[PDB]
Design a protein around this ligand. Structure first.
Ligand code: IXY
Length: 330
C-alpha cells in the first residue's frame, strides 16, 4: 500500500504545517500537524474543555461506529516549549491520503494548553517519531507509521515541505520526480526515540564550509532551526544589525536585511537553505525588527533540524530494520 497527502503552511510564515487526516466511520477529517519529533496521535475532541477550544475541528468518538474506548488508558504530554495536552484514548480507523490503519490509537484531549487553543488551524498532532516516546499509560500505543509499516510497499515516509507553499507527505514510496540529484542517506540513532542524526558541518552564505559534527534531530514538528551557539553566532554575524534579544528570546534582525543562505552537511552532500527561509517576520505587528529562523540550541540540550532546514530538502524517513534518514536538494 501507499499514501500521499498535501501539507499546507498554517500561515504566511510557515510556523507549522497541517495535513488532512480521516478519522472514524464515517470519516471525520481533521487537519493534523505531522510531527517527526513526537509519537502521540492526539486530537481536539468532543471531550475537550469547551473554553480551551476555539475554532478547531473536533473528533467526536460517540459518532464513530468503529471508535472503541481503550479501557483505563490516559495520555499526557509536554513539549519542551511550554505547551502540553492530555486526555483519554480510543482506537479507530485512521486514513492519510488513501492509506488506512485500523485500530490506530487516537488520543482524545480533555485538556490542551494555550499554544494549541490559540492555533485554530491545528486540530491535533500526528506523531511520526519512534513509538518508544508514546505517552499512553499504562500500555504504550504505536504511531500511525508504525501501524502501517508492514503494509507499505516500502517501510518509508518522505517529507517534502514547501516554502510559503503546499508540500507533500508520502507513505510507502519515494517520488523520484520530487528532488534534484541523488538522495544522500545518513545514520540514525533511535536511543532517544528521535530521527537523530549527525550533520557533517555548515557554511554561512558563500563562506567556506566548516567540517564539524552537529548531532541533532530531523523534526517536522518544530518551526525553526536550532543549532549550537557558535554556529548560530557565525550566521548572524553576517547580517548587519542582527543581535540576540533577551526581551524577545533569540536573535532578531532588521527587517530590511537581505539574509544569507545557510548550508548544512549530509555526509559529503550539502543542503542549502535560502536566506528567505530564515526570515520569520516582525517580532510584533508593525515592527521593523524581524525574528530569525535560526536560533541557539543552548538551553535545549539537543540541536533541532526543524522546518526551516527540512523545507529546503526532500527528506526520507526510512523505517527499515536499521532506520536511516535521507536528504536530497529540490
Ligand atoms: O516536541 C517536538 C515537536 N513537537 C512540537 C509540538 C508543538 C509544541 N507546541 C506547538 C504549537 C503548535 C503546533 C505544534 C506544537 N520537538 C522537540 S524534541 C526535543 C525538544 C522539542 C521541542 O519542544 N521543539 C519545539 C521548540 C523547541 C525549542 C523552543 C521552542 C519550541 C526539546 C528537548 C529535547 C528533545
Amino acid at each position: 500500500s501507499t499514501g500521499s497527502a498535501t501539507t499546507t503552511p498554517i500561515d504566511s510564515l510557515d510556523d507549522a504545517y497541517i495535513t488532512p487526516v480521516q478519522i472514524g466511520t464515517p470519516a471525520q477529517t481533521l487537519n493534523l500537524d505531522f510531527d517527526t519529533g513526537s509519537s502521540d496521535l492526539w486530537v481536539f475532541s468532543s471531550e475537550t474543555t469547551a473554553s480551551e477550544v476555539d475554532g478547531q475541528t473536533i473528533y467526536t468518538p460517540s459518532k464513530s461506529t468503529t471508535a472503541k474506548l481503550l479501557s483505563g488508558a490516559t495520555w499526557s504530554i509536554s513539549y519542551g516549549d511550554g505547551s502540553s495536552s492530555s486526555g483519554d484514548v480510543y482506537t479507530d480507523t485512521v486514513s492519510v491520503g488513501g492509506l488506512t490503519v485500523t485500530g490506530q490509537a487516537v488520543e482524545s484531549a480533555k485538556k490542551v494548553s494555550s499554544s494549541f487553543t490559540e492555533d485554530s488551524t491545528i486540530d491535533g498532532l500526528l506523531g511520526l517519531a519512534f513509538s518508544t516516546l508514546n505517552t499512553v499509560s499504562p500500555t504504550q500505543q504505536k504511531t500511525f507509521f508504525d501501524n502501517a509499516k508492514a503494509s507499505l510497499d516500502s517501510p518509508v515516509f518522505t517529507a517534502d515541505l514547501g516554502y510559503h507553499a503546499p508540500g507533500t507527505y508520502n507513505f510507502g514510496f519515494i517520488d523520484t520526480t520530487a528532488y534534484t540529484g541523488s538522495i544522500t542517506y545518513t545514520a540514525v540513532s533511535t536511543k532517544q526515540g528521535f530521527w537523530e542524526w549527525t550533520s557533517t558541518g555548515y557554511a554561512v552564505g558563500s563562506g567556506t564550509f566548516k567540517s564539524t559534527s552537529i548531532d541533532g534531530i530531523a523534526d517536522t514538528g518544530t518551526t525553526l532551526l536550532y543549532l549550537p551557539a557558535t554556529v548560530v553566532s557565525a550566521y548572524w554575524a553576517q547580517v548587519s544589525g542582527a543581535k540576540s534579544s533577551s526581551s524577545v528570546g533569540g536573535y532578531v534582525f532588521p527587517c530590511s536585511a537581505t539574509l544569507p543562505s545557510f548550508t548544512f552537511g549530509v555526509g559529503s552532500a550539502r543542503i542549502v537553505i535560502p536566506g528567505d527561509y530564515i526570515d520569520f517576520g516582525p517580532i510584533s505587528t508593525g515592527s521593523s525588527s524581524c525574528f530569525g529562523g535560526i536560533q541557539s540550541s543552548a538551553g535545549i540540550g539537543i540541536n533541532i533540524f526543524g522546518d526551516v532546514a527540512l523545507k529546503a530538502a526532500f527528506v526520507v524517513f526510512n523505517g527499515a530494520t536499521t532506520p536511516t534518514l535521507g536528504f536530497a536538494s529540490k
